[model samples]
Target chain A: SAPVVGIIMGSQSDWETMRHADALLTELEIPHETLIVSANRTPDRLADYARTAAERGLNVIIAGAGGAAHLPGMCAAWTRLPVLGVPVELKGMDSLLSIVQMPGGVPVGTLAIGASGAKNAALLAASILALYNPALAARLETWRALQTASVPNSPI
Target chain B: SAPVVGIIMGSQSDWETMRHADALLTELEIPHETLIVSANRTPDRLADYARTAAERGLNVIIAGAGGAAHLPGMCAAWTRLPVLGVPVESRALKGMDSLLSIVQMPGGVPVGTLAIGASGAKNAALLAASILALYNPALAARLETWRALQTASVPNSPIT
Candidate 1:
């Protein structure tokens, strides 16, 4: 079956952060695939992957990278498909900047940092897919309701 | 008046980010004093500021720094006062390292990290004032009203 979502991590090191995305997809029952692709290490492969994503039947792409994280932006540049960027926490502090300072024209919908971000990416992907799939859309509505329910009106 | 909130920046360059903290304090009607201190350049000054903050009448401290920012953690290490860290964007990667360094503090010393750059700095100040105002009835009422106004501004959904 053609994957609806594609999860690409810049380095094998990013698997920890990328795992959250995978977990959420599993929970949401969203069909997705994961890949190891570097933006600087393999620009041509990244470009090719982004260019052919829609034609290959993928609806959305989640790109997670650290440091000079250009993979998400570069992929967005190549495709009109919505690309969600997860800022994987790098060894130090470069990950945040790399993820947020994306140049204009290339729009990568950025999530929070680290695990929470990866989880949000999954939710965002589900939200996007819901636009087309009625069943999935129903699940998203339920999920959001559950989230709102969990938050108490007043802090304990 | 004695300062309830202490504003410390990692370097002179961080004035740009720390100024957001200043602006937020102004909006909240909270009085604060700003300082030009660095973690790497003057470790002793950083330690001194944090250690004496509570004794000096500070309820909260906001630390903004860029790159390998350690100001917030170091401040938290020296005092029990809650420290809010703002990861000012760096030249290359835009303060990712700074954010992580502050956010991923050791269990003993917890530093609440805000967003990177000015937005984060402003929120840091707001958070600090909110913490102080939590005990003050008049300030708390004002804050609650401000929060209500903010929530009112959010649209039901994004405009297509």
Candidate 2:
């Protein structure tokens, strides 16, 4: 099956954070594939993967990396596909700096840090899907309604 | 002579970030005092400073720290006075961990975590003043005017 979404992490370790992307695709019934391709370690693989991503039928790419996160930006550079960058929390201060510093002209839709960020990445991908699929859009609306319903006017 | 705001830093190195707090206080015309008190290095100072903040006329305390930033939470635990925490961008993760550690505090002890660096420190001071001026009509009016000016300064849209 041709995957519509490609979830790429800088390293295998990023599986911890990128799992949210997988779960989100599962909920949305969106066909996807996950890969370990590094911007720093495996530049040729990244270039090869990104250059052929669209021709392979991947509609959206979720690229997550920590410590000078160049995967998303570099992928975006190689491919015209819509790319979402997740700043995976690294041990030191590198995660924040790397994630936030996307150079101009080439824009990577960035998300927050950690688990909530991962959840949002899924939501974002689903929202992008919702643009074409009425059924998916309706499900997204229902999910939003459930979210609003969960929130109370007053604190417990 | 008395401090209206207590500026506490996690380490002597944090002077870089905490200075934003000092600068903001000066701009807002709020009197304040700064200290190099750490949560880990000097827990005693944290307890004493927080405990006596209100009695000493300090309404807000600005605590800046990096890494496993706990200075603000520790201060909040010690006093009823509001603690505004500025997460200093550390060498490792650019303050993401610091931000999470400080902002995601348990419900009982709330620390208003600011942005990662200087901007966060500036906003912390502004927020503290906004809170303090709530009881003072003149100050509140001044704040309103200031905000209006700020909004007016913004461009209608991003530069092309």
Candidate 3:
């Protein structure tokens, strides 16, 4: 099926982080797909993807990269689609900072570093999608309520 | 006295964040200097500064940059001197990109990563000064005082 949300990782190996976005999207009944796109290389492919993202029926872009991880910012540069970034923490601190500090003009809504970042990226995507889809809105609300219920009121 | 720490930021605009590092280093009495170094624009100058950084009697480096934020990482690449990175909170996402650009280094290179923006800059200076304190016992005590007061300033209750 044609994916609604696009998730790209710096490397195929980084799927470990991108997969969470896939899972959350799937759980929410959102049709999404993942890709491996390098910022340094595949410039042409990136340009093509970014230029045609909206026509491709892609509603949001989620990119995860590390070590001069330019994938998110580079993707954001070409498209106006709401781009969300997850800084892969395993590569250490570089991913976190690089994904968030996009200069002026282009903007990428970011989540915390690492796994939490991955999860939040999906939730944010859902939230944005839900703005127009009522069914998904309820699902997201349920997800949030369950999340709050699962948290212990007292600190461990 | 020769400066023990070298704090260089990417642009004059970054001084807002870089000033935190300056303040901490000054509070610790760790003589240091701060300057603006744009990596992409001033290649030759960056080359000169990095090459001579150590021989110039500087012990540690604190670099802060936003946007491309190549400042911290580039400084690390140029000099073997222990470099600390402070990601200035600027532009779109406010320092997330800055942190990423600076912190993730391949195995051989190391840049001590700090939080984003001013807090991180202050910590970078504290950490930098702490590195020099290995030999300067007096500075260590000052660091302890600064740290102690910082802790004291935090309210006992996080909720409050």
Candidate 4:
């Protein structure tokens, strides 16, 4: 059966980018659940989500947010699980920095900004989970091999 | 010369983005110093830089770097001086990771995080100006003019 992988977002708008994670998870069969969680609009709600993430069977959390993008940091603060952050192309600098600059005490392993980041987040999450799931691990290496094979030296 | 601002980067490569801060500061005729300091590669060097920044006659610090940009955070950690961070378009994640590595500080310490790449570096200088402008009346006037010109320079058209 599918285990714990959660995708948390700042707003529903983040779905436009985060949807890629859902697709990648499905392809890899990385059993994941998606939710809308905000550190700004709903601080208390986010705390509840983070505190209970692992207990609720979450192995990895992929958080996507725009603007101040505090979702990932706060989640990492409360949860012991690995939190991967994804940034939206929200504002200047492509919403790149807000999520990455976490504090010394709290560390958030941030992915690239935008949809590519989301895809990578899922892939990375699968890689983390693969440490335990042998079948998933094999599937992941095969996927990476195919990706490498598909890359042409020159663009079409 | 007494430097009011300090522009620091992780390595030589960061100058590509950090130069924008230097250029802006120079354009404003502001006195500042630039240097390289790394957290992982050379922790002691970063420590010494941040530790002496205030005593070295620096009022504000503008730090820029790419990749695992621990420069700004480490600078903030060593001293209480206000540090502005520029997220360079790093080679790995294209500046996304660099931005995150600098801005997200603990509640105790703070880094005024700017956008990624060139604009962020410019903002670092401008923000330093605004900070200095609190006391320097001449700089205040010049900064106001710059802001005005910046606003006026915008084309009326919304998009190309």
Candidate 5:
């Protein structure tokens, strides 16, 4: 099956954080591909990947990085599709800032730093895709309902 | 004037955002001292300043920084007084880095973190004012009037 979402990370080290996004998309039964795409080191590869992403059937790109996290913004620069950023844990702060504080014109919709952000990125991607896919919308609503129900009135 | 509060930032670049805090504190008529004390570049200066803040009759400290923002956390580490943080917008990161660095202080140390840039700076000063207002009746009355005016001045709907 063709992937509707592409989960890209800056380095292999980011796998530890980005795997959550991969797992969440799989859990949601959203077809997605995971790969390492460095925005800085491999400029040509990233350009090709991002430019061709739309034709490759990817509706959204989930880019994760740390340090001078540029994966999301760079990917967005090449593609017209939505790009969501997950700031990986390099003690977190650097990644969070690098990804979230994108300049005005090139926007990268960034989430929190670390695993919570990774999972949320996939959920966000799923929600966006669900706007067009009715079956996904139903599944997403049910998933959210279950999450809402699990929260107890009082904390243990 | 004997400063009851201290406003410190890492660099002159921060003054663009931090000046808002300075202005807000001035507007509130809170006697405060403002200076540049970097946690990295000028560690000794920050140490001396924060360590003596309580003894200096300072009730609160507002610290701002960009990049690896350690001014607020390090300041809090040295001082017993409440330290509020404003994340100055950075060239690349735009203060997201600054926000987390100052905010995510370990369990023992604490920095009351505010938003990013000018809004955060203003809010930090207002927070300091609110804290100071708890003890000063006149300032408390002034703060109440300011809040009332702010509420009264809000338009019911958008112009467009």
Candidate 6:
């Protein structure tokens, strides 16, 4: 199936953090493509990837970056698709602000600081896509159910 | 008297929020310069202002902005002085974007960020005072009194 979600990060280093997003999307049987596209280091690549994302059938873009992270906002600047940002923790706040603080014209629905954010970004994308795909919505519902069912009322 | 602190915001609209910092500094008798400088709209102006802040007798800078607020971090980037950021409330994200932008400076540049909206603005001024109080005994005494008053004013129990 053509990919519905695109998970792009700054560099290979981000893979360690962004992999969780990829894993969650896969677990939910959501087709996605993950790649590296640095906003500062490789602006042209980011521009090309983001500009063409929507036409390539990507409904949502999950961008992860660190150290004055600009990938998410820059991505949102180009594409009409909703961009979800996951800040890779390095002093944590540096990346978090870089991803979340997009100007009014552009929007990047930002999640938490690190791994939790990556997972949530994928889930948020899944939720957005679910609005259109009933089958995916059902799968997501089951996944959420399992998550809720596995939790115990008392701490171990 | 020379200005020891600089309070800057992105636009006139920000005055509604940044005014708290101004008023607090007035209450403390801290001489400060308040003006407007946008990081995005007026990059050169911001660059010049921040770059020259320290030599101009400014010890600390307090910057407030809404929507992808970058004044604080960018100010810190230009000057070696400690920069305090106040995330002005934005229409869309409720200053979440502003908070993250200012608070999340890279490792090299640091911005001591406060909460979102009016309270954050007030606290930024207070924190700036605390920083200055380290050297000025008079300000320190005044700050202590202010803190004590705040503490004493708090009720032990909530009124229903």
| Interface RMSD per candidate (angstroms) | 13.9, 14.1, 6.1, 17.1, 12.3, 5.1
lDDT of each: 0.73, 0.72, 0.78, 0.74, 0.84, 0.85
Tens digits of per-residue lDDT for model 3 on B1-160?
7887888887889899999999988877878888888543443465578768999999898888887666565566668799898888866767666766766654566789899988898899878877888888988888788788888998876683
**Cα-based lDDT at residue A13, candidate 2:** 82
lDDT score at residue B155, model 2, on the 0-100 scale: 88
lDDT of 3 at A121: 96
User: Under CAPRI classification, how is model 3 graded?
Assistant: incorrect
Worst 10 residues of 3 chain A by lDDT: A38-47
Q: What RMSD, rounded to one decimal, does every model reach? A: 15.2, 14.9, 11.5, 16.3, 15.7, 9.0
Clashing pairs in 2: A92-B92, A92-B93, A93-B92, A93-B93, A93-B94, A94-B92, A94-B93
Give the alpha carbon lDDT tens digit for every residue of A49-131 in model 3. 87689998999999887677666766787787999998876454566656665566668888877777888899999999999
Candidate 4 pairs with clashing backbones: A100-B100, A100-B101, A101-B100, A101-B104, A102-B104, A103-B104
Candidate 6 residues A49-145, lDDT tens each? 8879989999999999877676787678778899999989746676776666666667889999888899999999999999998999999999999
| Model 5 stretches astray by more than 4 angstroms | A1-156
Per-residue CA lDDT of model 1 for B35-142, tens digit only, reads 988888899998888878766877678888888888887886676555667788888886767766666654334465567788777667765654555356577677
Task: Compose the digit string of candidate 4's lDDT tens values, residues A22-41.
Answer: 88889998888988999989
TM-score of each: 0.51, 0.50, 0.54, 0.53, 0.54, 0.58
Residue-pair clashes per candidate: 6, 7, 13, 6, 0, 0
Q: lDDT tens string, model 2, A12-85?
A: 88889889878877877888999999999999999999989867977678888887888877886676555666
lDDT, model 1, position B80:
57
Q: Please identify which of the two predictions, 3 or 5, would achieve the higher lDDT against the true structure.
A: 5
* Candidate 1 Cα outliers beyond 4 Å, as residue runs: A1-156, B154-160
Candidate 4 error regions (>4 Å): A1-156, B158-160
Name the top lDDT candidate. 6
In terms of lDDT, model 4 sits at 0.74
Task: Give every collision pair in model 1.
Answer: A92-B97, A93-B96, A93-B97, A94-B97, A96-B96, A97-B93
